[PDB]
Amino acid sequence: TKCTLKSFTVEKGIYQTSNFRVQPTESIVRFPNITNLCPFDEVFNATRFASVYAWNRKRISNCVADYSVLYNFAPFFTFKCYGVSPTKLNDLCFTNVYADSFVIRGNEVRQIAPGQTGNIADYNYKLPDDFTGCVIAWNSNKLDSKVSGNYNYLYRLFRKSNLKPFERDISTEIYQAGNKPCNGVAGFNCYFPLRSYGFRPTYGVGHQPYRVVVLSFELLHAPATVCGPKKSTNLVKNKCVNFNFNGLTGTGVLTESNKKFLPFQQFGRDIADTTDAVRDPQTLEILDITPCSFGGVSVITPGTNTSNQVAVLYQGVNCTEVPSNVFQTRAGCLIGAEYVNNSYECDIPIGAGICASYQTQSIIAYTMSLGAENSVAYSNNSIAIPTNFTISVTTEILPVSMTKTSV
Amino acid sequence: AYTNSFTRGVYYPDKVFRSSVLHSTQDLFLPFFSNVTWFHNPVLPFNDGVYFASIEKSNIIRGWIFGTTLDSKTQSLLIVNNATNVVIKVCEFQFCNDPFMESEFRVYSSANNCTFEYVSKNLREFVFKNIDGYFKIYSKHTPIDLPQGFSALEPLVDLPIGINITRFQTLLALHRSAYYVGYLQPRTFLLKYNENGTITDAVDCALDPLSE
Amino acid sequence: ILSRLDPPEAEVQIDRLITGRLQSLQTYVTQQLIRAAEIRASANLAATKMSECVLGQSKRVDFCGKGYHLMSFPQSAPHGVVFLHVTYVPAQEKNFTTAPAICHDGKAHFPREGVFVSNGTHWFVTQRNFYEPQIITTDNTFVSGN
Amino acid sequence: DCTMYICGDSTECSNLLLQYGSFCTQLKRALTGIAVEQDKNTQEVFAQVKQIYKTPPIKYFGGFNFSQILPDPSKPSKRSPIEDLLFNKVKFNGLTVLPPLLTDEMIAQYTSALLAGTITSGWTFGAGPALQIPFPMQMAYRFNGIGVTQNVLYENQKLIANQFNSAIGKIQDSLSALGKLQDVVNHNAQALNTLVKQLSSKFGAISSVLNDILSRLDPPEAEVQIDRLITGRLQSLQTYVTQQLIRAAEIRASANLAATKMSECVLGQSKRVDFCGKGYHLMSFPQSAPHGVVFLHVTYVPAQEKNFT
Amino acid sequence: DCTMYICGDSTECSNLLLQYGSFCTQLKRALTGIAVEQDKNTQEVFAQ
Ligand SMILES: *[C@@H]1O[C@H](CO)[C@@H](O[C@@H]2O[C@H](CO)[C@@H](O)[C@H](O)[C@H]2NC(C)=O)[C@H](O)[C@H]1NC(C)=O
Ligand SMILES: *[C@@H]1O[C@H](CO)[C@@H](O[C@@H]2O[C@H](CO)[C@@H](O)[C@H](O)[C@H]2NC(C)=O)[C@H](O)[C@H]1NC(C)=O
Ligand SMILES: *[C@@H]1O[C@H](CO)[C@@H](O[C@@H]2O[C@H](CO)[C@@H](O)[C@H](O)[C@H]2NC(C)=O)[C@H](O)[C@H]1NC(C)=O
Ligand SMILES: *[C@@H]1O[C@H](CO)[C@@H](O[C@@H]2O[C@H](CO)[C@@H](O)[C@H](O)[C@H]2NC(C)=O)[C@H](O)[C@H]1NC(C)=O
Ligand SMILES: *[C@@H]1O[C@H](CO)[C@@H](O[C@@H]2O[C@H](CO)[C@@H](O)[C@H](O)[C@H]2NC(C)=O)[C@H](O)[C@H]1NC(C)=O
Ligand SMILES: *[C@@H]1O[C@H](CO)[C@@H](O[C@@H]2O[C@H](CO)[C@@H](O)[C@H](O)[C@H]2NC(C)=O)[C@H](O)[C@H]1NC(C)=O
Ligand SMILES: *[C@@H]1O[C@H](CO)[C@@H](O[C@@H]2O[C@H](CO)[C@@H](O)[C@H](O)[C@H]2NC(C)=O)[C@H](O)[C@H]1NC(C)=O
Ligand SMILES: *[C@@H]1O[C@H](CO)[C@@H](O[C@@H]2O[C@H](CO)[C@@H](O)[C@H](O)[C@H]2NC(C)=O)[C@H](O)[C@H]1NC(C)=O
Ligand SMILES: *[C@@H]1O[C@H](CO)[C@@H](O)[C@H](O)[C@H]1NC(C)=O
Ligand SMILES: *[C@@H]1O[C@H](CO)[C@@H](O)[C@H](O)[C@H]1NC(C)=O
Ligand SMILES: *[C@@H]1O[C@H](CO)[C@@H](O)[C@H](O)[C@H]1NC(C)=O
Ligand SMILES: *[C@@H]1O[C@H](CO)[C@@H](O)[C@H](O)[C@H]1NC(C)=O
Ligand SMILES: *[C@@H]1O[C@H](CO)[C@@H](O)[C@H](O)[C@H]1NC(C)=O
Ligand SMILES: *[C@@H]1O[C@H](CO)[C@@H](O)[C@H](O)[C@H]1NC(C)=O
Ligand SMILES: *[C@@H]1O[C@H](CO)[C@@H](O)[C@H](O)[C@H]1NC(C)=O
Ligand SMILES: *[C@@H]1O[C@H](CO)[C@@H](O)[C@H](O)[C@H]1NC(C)=O
Incomplete structure (x- = not known):
């Protein structure tokens, strides 16, 4: 109070000095699930792969992509990612995810890479120079190699000129080297x-x-497509924190609601268009969002020439969310004054009929009186007439002018 | 023929629940008391969205065709619904000029490069629009020349296609052994919500001085 | 600004400060006009009381002090005026029995001014503002009705 | 609260507020200085009596029936049957509403004490001690004060009591009007709603959201655009305060008139033409309203003139 | 007429002006509120 008033002597009264302000705890980012996992499950498990010269080609669509099964698979030999890092596969979004698969010899995996040469990479499968995909390659001896020779997988080693990136050639026309x-x-x-x-x-x-x-992304023109997966964090209630419901960012206390949305609506707004209820994506329940507990803080002082005791009123703050004598009023919680059952003349007005005074010493605070009470002795044939009088003098003060200023 | 709509083609502009709140919205609607063409067929324009009502207990309407050229060499949308459920599909097709035992589906003869798949009296209303590459459909099936009343239409699909549309046609089930076409304009309405959160009434803010 | 910056950019920085301080002057002058209307309304009340409390006797309740207005004296104060209000206040009441009229010769008599009171055994006429009883006569009263 | 309106829980904006000086100091004092006067306005209208007067249990005054203006011991709190019509007919982002100091229950007793004094004591309690006098005799004095002899009342006492009792009973029909009170509530509510809606203006920035600009842009540029939002929102908030001071003067002017009528119409008999109702003033009774006061003015009106030479 | 003073019938300015919210609605309400009281002031002085 002294600092706000810029003085070391404060006169009796009530001063607004600051403000309360409840703070949010924890940061919960909620979402739904995954629905369609867009099954990588088969392109990495196809029992009959394709020979390199005629390589299969599966195109992902609008889906949910969870690459955590790939990186954490645990059984690889080569996994190199050129466009984007291997960990940021779950926070981007691309339009068309192409997936190529085939089988090749051991020491030729060094040729599935941008800008290489050799009997395999030259004309069987050519990756461009501005690749953005992600190459995975492992050993499959025990699954595809059968003693005595397994002559199913072919690989072309004669062609007119080298291939074009992502092109495909399956012809079987007999070569011609001579004239x-x-x-x-x-x-x-x-x-x-x-x-x-x-x-x-x-x-x-x-x-x-x-x-x-090999995976290959390309974002032609689509507004939005298959992106990474969402995420969790247990949902708490009755604790104004920091929340995010699939894009809806806010702060407040979450409580069970009694509203009924239509079976297509996610969240509600109040009059003046502010969000006041949401639906949990996972449990499909409506929760109200109430503001925390902010408010002004006022200091009640008898005057520094009387005492240095003080009481504090937290305006419209519930007495359970403030952090002796705690008194609840319709104006907030009053701490540091007692509540008596007597009624005095108002001295320091608090509000809603409540005043404070320095009488009974620490500092207290009762109800408000209304003055003395008096019955007039009325009857149907009685009168009261004065027999004496006094002359009184009273003052009245009125301002008439201000100082004249010019800038 | 032409007919007079009354208060038709009003759909939920978005998500967002809501209670007793006379909310004002601006969007693409079918204007109240509008001039809607009547058909009992030829390629029709698109220009900005379409209102599509119909009446009949049986199911004569057997899908729609959308796109820019309604022909091959480019991709188009095709929506059909057999006795199972609705099938959205976006491929490059080759459409019969007159598309239509109990054997059927003589509509197209090509389905290349498919970029989207999906499988799963009476008034059947639809609202079609195409904004930022999204093709929205609203619909509602309410049992009973159209009558007179108000009923708001809810979202049906959400389709991230990318497709451009300038013209479309319709498909009918022939006999071997009635529909409406409106268009949407940018208008403003004042929507009345009940306590359940549904639209119960509306005011067209561009009709008569009293509405203003 | 100029000391450490070229004109092309200094014009922008000075224009921001000018706008800010020009807003300060608009705030100042607007409040002086609103506050001058309040002191003007007070000066109008003080001028009205000067006429009606000092240059005459008012019957307006509570306009010239508490009690029955007799007179007022002005005093000068810095930027203001002080009124010394002189009032009449009755004191020390007694209760009496009363009646609206008195019958004599079959006729009703009403007071010209005053009220009828009874001290317990006899009835008198008194004025309403000071207890001063007189005998009820035909010169004190008038007749009307039966 | 200027900080929650302008910045809204944002530390980058909060530090930028330090470059504007003491604008929030002016804003808090301007709104607080006119909030204190609002309790003063209600004390000067109703708290014009030192004692809390009560009527006798034998509510019956020379034939006059006052039960519709006196408290009825069987209602919400303690209102008259007429006051019940008067009261029955009528945390966002810093925008806080403070409660009045006097509750509606406290105003009702001030008004019931004024009513008891004027019925049992006439106009004497406003110049000293309350002096009892029977009511029929009070009304005779009041006729004398307008130029009518007192015998005209005493020989017609039953007629005047019948006419008064019917005239009061017609008030509830006219109430079951208050636009002067509803306009105050509506004008302030519309100003509070407009203040909120200015939080969706760009004021020449790229986004209206402070957690947006700074996050995707460039700090050196975000600072200039956030300062444009601060300036635009500060100007909105300053406009709000200026209009509250202009409106506060109108409420004070009305409250000064209501206080003047309370003394000159209820605690006495006025001769000022049209000041205390139309006709020759006899008496007035106050009633409380949600943010105001309602006066019931009783006047004498002559009728049925004849020609004479 | 707010728009005609600030922009003066220019579609580029008037579209940018929309970005400032509803200042042009406040100006009209303020002027209407004091223009209606001008007839009320005269009506209460003479219609006695
Ligand atoms: C999202 O996935 C969760 C599971 O991760 C689904 O939760 C199921 O909800 C039903 C009721 O609707 C319960 O009977 C099941 O027991 C829940 N499963 C589990 C594992 O708790 C949830 O329904 C899914 N949401 C949608 C919209 O399909
Ligand atoms: C890839 O294929 C293997 C074998 O074909 C699948 O292995 C299964 O492993 C789980 C875990 O031990 C067993 O419970 C199943 O019974 C196995 N499958 C069979 C057919 O026996 C593996 O699940 C496949 N990958 C994925 C992602 O499903
Ligand atoms: C006039 O008489 C009345 C009673 O008729 C007096 O009022 C009584 O006063 C006493 C003393 O204060 C109280 O104890 C009683 O309760 C009062 N009676 C009623 C009915 O209120 C009044 O004081 C007398 N006036 C004077 C000057 O003596
Ligand atoms: C009216 O009141 C005054 C006091 O205010 C009375 O005057 C006093 O009377 C006593 C004797 O009763 C004297 O001792 C005092 O000196 C007087 N005071 C003054 C200032 O002169 C006066 O007598 C009262 N009148 C009646 C009739 O009782
Ligand atoms: C009421 O006042 C009268 C007059 O003072 C008192 O009556 C007596 O009247 C005769 C004349 O008729 C006087 O000579 C006496 O001196 C009076 N006596 C007194 C005591 O004043 C009468 O006593 C008074 N009544 C009461 C109840 O006090
Ligand atoms: C004064 O008027 C009230 C009505 O304002 C009278 O109360 C009514 O009395 C009649 C007869 O008993 C009842 O039928 C009504 O129900 C009463 N009204 C209410 C609201 O209670 C009252 O009787 C009148 N007083 C006198 C003395 O005549
Ligand atoms: C004065 O006027 C009143 C009416 O304003 C007269 O009173 C009415 O008289 C009629 C006829 O007798 C009755 O039916 C009504 O019931 C009366 N009204 C009331 C409220 O009592 C009154 O008679 C007139 N006085 C004279 C002397 O003519
Ligand atoms: C007093 O007498 C005058 C006539 O001297 C009456 O005037 C009449 O007024 C009406 C309109 O109110 C005219 O239509 C008549 O023609 C007038 N009469 C005459 C004879 O000129 C007046 O009405 C009388 N006043 C009362 C109260 O009876
Ligand atoms: C204030 O202090 C002075 C001494 O400095 C003392 O005389 C006076 O009584 C004090 N006032 C109160 C209200 O205590
Ligand atoms: C404070 O919260 C408790 C519940 O925790 C509730 O019982 C009490 O009524 C609240 N107080 C106020 C003033 O709302
Ligand atoms: C006040 O009185 C009430 C009963 O009316 C009682 O319950 C309460 O304890 C009292 N308060 C104090 C502080 O004594
Ligand atoms: C609709 O407009 C056409 C002209 O474009 C007109 O011929 C037709 O009569 C109109 N329909 C109605 C119902 O007014
Ligand atoms: C329904 O139509 C779709 C699209 O032609 C087709 O895939 C599906 O097999 C059909 N169902 C039946 C039962 O014929
Ligand atoms: C579309 O199909 C044609 C063959 O009809 C083919 O040449 C072309 O590569 C296909 N486009 C895509 C993106 O697959
Ligand atoms: C749709 O056509 C317009 C030209 O009318 C073109 O500019 C736009 O790119 C097309 N949209 C798509 C998604 O192809
Ligand atoms: C829907 O609204 C009606 C009133 O129109 C109401 O009676 C009914 O309870 C509501 N239904 C639900 C599920 O809230």
Whole structure:
């Protein structure tokens, strides 16, 4: 009070000096679930993969993508990601997620990469120079290699000119290296263009069959598409904290409501268009949002020339949310004064019929009186007439002028 | 023929629940007491959204076709509903010029490059609009020339397609063994909500000086 | 601003300060006009009391002090006026029995001014503001009705 | 609260408020200085009696029936049957409403004490001690004060009591009007709503939300745009305060008139033409209203003139 | 007429002016409130 008034002597009265202000605890970010996990489950588990020269191609759609099963899978040998980091796969959003899969020899995985050369990367599968995808590749000896030779997987090693990025060529036209046209017969300078990896379990690393999958994103023009997954954090109630309901950011106390939304509405607003209720995405229950507990703080003083005792009123603050003599009034919680049952003339007005005084010493605070009471001795044939009088003098004061200023 | 709408083509402008609150909204609606064309067929324009009502206990309407060219060489939307449920689909099609045992589906003969799949008297109202690449559909089926009354339409789908639309057609079930087409304009209404949160009345803020 | 900045940018910085301090003057002058209307209303009340409390006798209740107005004396105060209000206050009442009229010769007599009182055994006429009884005569009363 | 209106729980904005000086000091004092006067306005109208007077249990005054203006011991709190019509007919982001000092129950007793004094003691309690006098004799004095002899009342006492009792009973029909009280509530409510709605203006910034600008932009630029929001919102808030001072003077002017009528119409008999109702003033009775006072003016009106030479 | 003073029938200015909220509604209400009382002031002095 002294600091607000800029003085060291405060006169008796009541002074507004500051403000209460309840603070929120914890930060809960709520959401729904995942619904459609858009099943990566098969492109990484397809029992019959495809030979490299005719490689399969699966395109993800609007879905929920949870890459945590990939990174945390635990059984890999090569996982390199070029466009975006391996951990930020769950906070971005892309339009079309293409997924390629095939099998190749061991020491050729160094060729599934932007800007390489060799009999495999040249013309079987060409990644561009501005790749943005994510390459995963592991060993699959025990699943795809069968003793005696498994001659299913082919790989082209003859072609006119190198491939184009993301292009595909499956023809079986007989090569022609010489000058004499072939007429489709193998032999001298007319070679078949397809060979086969003969896998066996008794091979060294670098020749056992590896399985390779590559992801590739591209954001053509869509407004929004498959993004990363949301997240949790237990939901508490009756504790004004910091909340987020799938985009709705705010502060306040969450409580069970009694409103009934329509079966398509997420949240409600009050008059003047401020959000006052939401629906929990997971449990589908309506919760009201009330503001915390802020308010002014006033200091009640008898005057520094009387005492240095003081009581404090927290305006419209409940007496359970403030952090002796605690008194609840319709104007807030009064602490540091007692509540008596007598009634005096008002001295320091608090509000709603309550006043404070320095009488009974610490500091107290009762009801408000209304003055003395008196019955007039009325009857139907009685009169009262004065027999004497006094002359009284009283003052009245009125202002008439101010100082004249000019700027 | 042409008919006179009364108070039709009012739909929930958005989510957001609400109670007794005379809320004012600006959006694309079918104006009250408007001039709606009548059909008993040819390619119709789109220009900005479509109102589509109909009346009949049986199901004569067997989907719609939307897009810019209504032909091959470019992608288009196709909405059908057999006795199972609604099937949204967005591919490049080749549509019959006259699309329509008990064997059916002679509408198209090509379905390339599909970018979206989905499977699962009487008045059947629809509101179609296409904003920022989103194709919205509102609908409601209420049992009983159209009558006179008010009924707000709720969202049905949310389709992140990207498709452009300038024209569309309709599909009918022929006999081998009636519908309306309005369009939407930017108008302002004053919407009355009940305590359950539904729209019970509306005022068209561009009709008569009293409405202003 | 100029000492450490070129004109092209100094014009913007000075224009911001000018706008801020010009807003200060608008706030100041607007409040002086609103507050001058209040002191003017007070000066009108003081001028009205000067006429009606000092240059005459008022019957307006509580306009010239508490009690029955007799007279007032002005005093000068800095930027104001002080009124010394002289009032008449009755004191020390007694109760009496009363009646609206008196019958004599079959006729009703009413007081010209005053009230009828009884001291317990005899009735008198008194004036209403000071107890001063006189005998009820035909010169004190008038006749009207039966 | 200027900080919660302008910034709204934002530390970047709160520190920027320090560059504007003492604007919040002016805002708090301007609104507080006119809030204190509002309790003074109600004390000067109703607290014009030192004692709390009561009527006798034998509510019957020369034939006059006052039961519709006196408290009725069987109602919410303690209102007259007529005051019940008067009361029955009528935390966002810093915008706080303070309660009045006097409750409606406290105003009702002030008004019931004024009513008891004028019925049992006439106009004597306002110049000293309350002096009892029977009511029929009070009304005869009041006729004398307007130029009518007193015998005209005493020979027609039953007629005047019948006419008064019917005239009072017509008041409840006219009430079951108060626009002078409803306008005050509506004008302030519309100003509070407008103040909130100015929180969705850009004032030449890119976004209206302080947690938006600073987050996606550039701090050096966010500071200039946040200062534009602070300036625009401060100007809105200053406009609010200026209009409250202009409106506070209108309420005080009305409260000064209501206090003047209380003394000159209820605690006495006035000769001022039209000041205490239309006709020759006899008496007045106060009634409380939610944010005001209602006076019942009783006047004498002559009728049925004849021609003479 | 708020718009005609500030912008003077210019679609670029008038569209930017909308970004300031409803100041042009407050100006009209204030002027209407004091323009109605001008007839009330005259009516109560002479219609006696
Ligand atoms: C989102 O997923 C949760 C599970 O993670 C679903 O919770 C189920 O809700 C039903 C009632 O609707 C309960 O009977 C189940 O027991 C819940 N499951 C669990 C594991 O608690 C929730 O319903 C899903 N939300 C939607 C909209 O489908
Ligand atoms: C990938 O394939 C393997 C085998 O084909 C699946 O393995 C299953 O493992 C779980 C956990 O031990 C068992 O409970 C199942 O019985 C196994 N499947 C079978 C058919 O026996 C594995 O689940 C597949 N990946 C995913 C993500 O489902
Ligand atoms: C006039 O008589 C009345 C009674 O008729 C007196 O009022 C009584 O006063 C006494 C003393 O204060 C109280 O104890 C009684 O309760 C009063 N009676 C009633 C009915 O109120 C009054 O004091 C007398 N006046 C004078 C000057 O003596
Ligand atoms: C009216 O009141 C005054 C006092 O205010 C009375 O005057 C006093 O009378 C006593 C004797 O009773 C004297 O001793 C005092 O000196 C007087 N005071 C003054 C100032 O002169 C006066 O007598 C009272 N009148 C009646 C009739 O009782
Ligand atoms: C009422 O006052 C009268 C007059 O003073 C008293 O009556 C007596 O009247 C005769 C004349 O008729 C006088 O000579 C006596 O001196 C009077 N006596 C007194 C005591 O004053 C009468 O006594 C008074 N009544 C009461 C009840 O006090
Ligand atoms: C004064 O008027 C009141 C009505 O304002 C009278 O009260 C009514 O009395 C009649 C007869 O007993 C009842 O039928 C009504 O129900 C009463 N009204 C209420 C509201 O209670 C009252 O009787 C009158 N007093 C006198 C002395 O005549
Ligand atoms: C004065 O006027 C009143 C009416 O304002 C007269 O009183 C009415 O008289 C009629 C006829 O006798 C009765 O039916 C009514 O009931 C009376 N009204 C009331 C309220 O009592 C009165 O008679 C007139 N006086 C004279 C002398 O003519
Ligand atoms: C007093 O007498 C005058 C006539 O001297 C009456 O005047 C009449 O007024 C009415 C209109 O109110 C005219 O239509 C008549 O023509 C007038 N009469 C005459 C003879 O001129 C007046 O009405 C009388 N007043 C009363 C109260 O009876
Ligand atoms: C204030 O202090 C002075 C001494 O400095 C003392 O005389 C006076 O009584 C005090 N006032 C009160 C109300 O205590
Ligand atoms: C404070 O909260 C408790 C419940 O925790 C409630 O019982 C009490 O009535 C509240 N006080 C006020 C003044 O609202
Ligand atoms: C006041 O009186 C009430 C009963 O009316 C009693 O319950 C309460 O304890 C009293 N308060 C004090 C402080 O004695
Ligand atoms: C609708 O407008 C057309 C002209 O575009 C007109 O021929 C037709 O009569 C109108 N319909 C109604 C119901 O007014
Ligand atoms: C319904 O139509 C869709 C789309 O043509 C089709 O996929 C589905 O198999 C149909 N259902 C039946 C039962 O024919
Ligand atoms: C669309 O289909 C054509 C063949 O009809 C094909 O050439 C083209 O690559 C396809 N587009 C996409 C994006 O798959
Ligand atoms: C729709 O057509 C417009 C031209 O009318 C074009 O500018 C726009 O890019 C198209 N939208 C899409 C999603 O292709
Ligand atoms: C819907 O509103 C009606 C009143 O129109 C009400 O009676 C009914 O209880 C409401 N239904 C629900 C589920 O709240």
